[PDB]
Assembly symmetry: D2
Homo-oligomer: 116 residues x 4
Amino acid sequence: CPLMVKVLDAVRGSPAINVAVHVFRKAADDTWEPFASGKTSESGELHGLTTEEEFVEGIYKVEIDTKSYWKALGISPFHEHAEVVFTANDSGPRRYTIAALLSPYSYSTTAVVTNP
Amino acid sequence: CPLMVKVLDAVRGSPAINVAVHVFRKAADDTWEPFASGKTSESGELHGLTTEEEFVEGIYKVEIDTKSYWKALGISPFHEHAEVVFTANDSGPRRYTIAALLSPYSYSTTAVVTN
Amino acid sequence: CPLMVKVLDAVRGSPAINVAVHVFRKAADDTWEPFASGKTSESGELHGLTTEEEFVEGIYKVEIDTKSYWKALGISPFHEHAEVVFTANDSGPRRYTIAALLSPYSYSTTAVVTN
Amino acid sequence: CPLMVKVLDAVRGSPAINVAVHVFRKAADDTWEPFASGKTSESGELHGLTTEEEFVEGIYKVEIDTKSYWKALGISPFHEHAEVVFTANDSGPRRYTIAALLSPYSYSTTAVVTNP
Ligand SMILES: COc1cc(O)c2c(=O)cc(-c3ccc(O)c(O)c3)oc2c1
Ligand SMILES: COc1cc(O)c2c(=O)cc(-c3ccc(O)c(O)c3)oc2c1
Ligand code: NA
Ligand code: NA
């Protein structure tokens, strides 16, 4: 898979398990079209969102459902979600790992991009 | 003003100057309505976006134009922009500072909410 | 003052108040010599640590007592402290702000160096 | 191995390769004794620093040689190194991953702690 999402919990020092993730792709009319979705596993990772064939050039938005995550742990957090927006595959196919590190009032996100 | 945005550059160890910032309010039909905008100052800060009277409870989005910032420095970045989406809540402290720390392939954002 | 320390709490979205901070200078024999210290204020800031005359070039270490901060809030943390080690350089801009953003199992630190 | 170090480069969007790491353990006299060292691989990971038997309770310091890393890439960075200091194994053996995300004037570090 050319798109993977990894989420960590900075309060617990653990993977962030059962985090919902929705991916969108900007359409020709400039709307955000639903592209793929899933949830993180016990390891904090979400694999299998898409395929090399389907993951064409485009502008993609990875929404990480942080508020839904934190509230289930009894924490009222600040953000609604984390949104990671990027152009993909503009120089040919790449593999993308989107990582996020979550706290109730803060998050950081990183991308690791590799050429297969 | 109840909303301030502060932007820092983790590559040069400096405020991120002249960065465009757009704030939107979520409307009843779920679209994003322009609310306020500006450019960060020489200190990386953008003050005066709104007033107590206008900044009612609701969902807001702060978009920070990170891509143009990095391109003006000759650096190829990953993200189109950084987006910070949150609910304004009258029960909490009254002053919101949205801080962002920028790198070409990463950013971190924080909310400092005080009285 | 050429050196300021700012500490933020990523769990509560607030300044980190009453955090002990110790600054050390590296001596010729490689040991760490106490240099300045204090506690962060209600704004999470510690001003007045040193002066231009005393803050000569060299290697400095800023230790932030994060463990005591989290324990006073009833939260079990990972780190003993956060340590920031850097060289002061007269060629660069003259004012150093060392910022730290704290979580129980993580921290991030940044240097904002300006004139 | 119960101690692993992972390092990422926030400028390049890549693993941070060939980063030197020195681990110390506080001795009874309160000095920092050299405990293990190594360097990150092509994946940004450093495995095999220690063993379950040798990684006893203690206060450990993981020094990540960030300045040496960045200068080789033609970047004069701010910090000398990142130092991650923590008590380990105080409630019995655990597995620790120390992760760091590096920029020239900033870094963030996280721990993921698991119970085997
Ligand atoms: C199990 O421990 C791991 C494993 C990873 O793959 C990762 C990873 O891929 C990325 C990061 C990370 C660390 C600090 C940040 O501020 C950030 O945005 C990301 O942590 C990990 C920790
Ligand atoms: C001038 O120095 C300052 C001043 C500030 O108010 C701030 C501030 O409000 C927040 C942060 C900050 C630091 C690290 C992060 O990972 C992050 O997301 C934010 O840095 C500052 C630095
Ligand atoms: Na192209
Ligand atoms: Na014990």
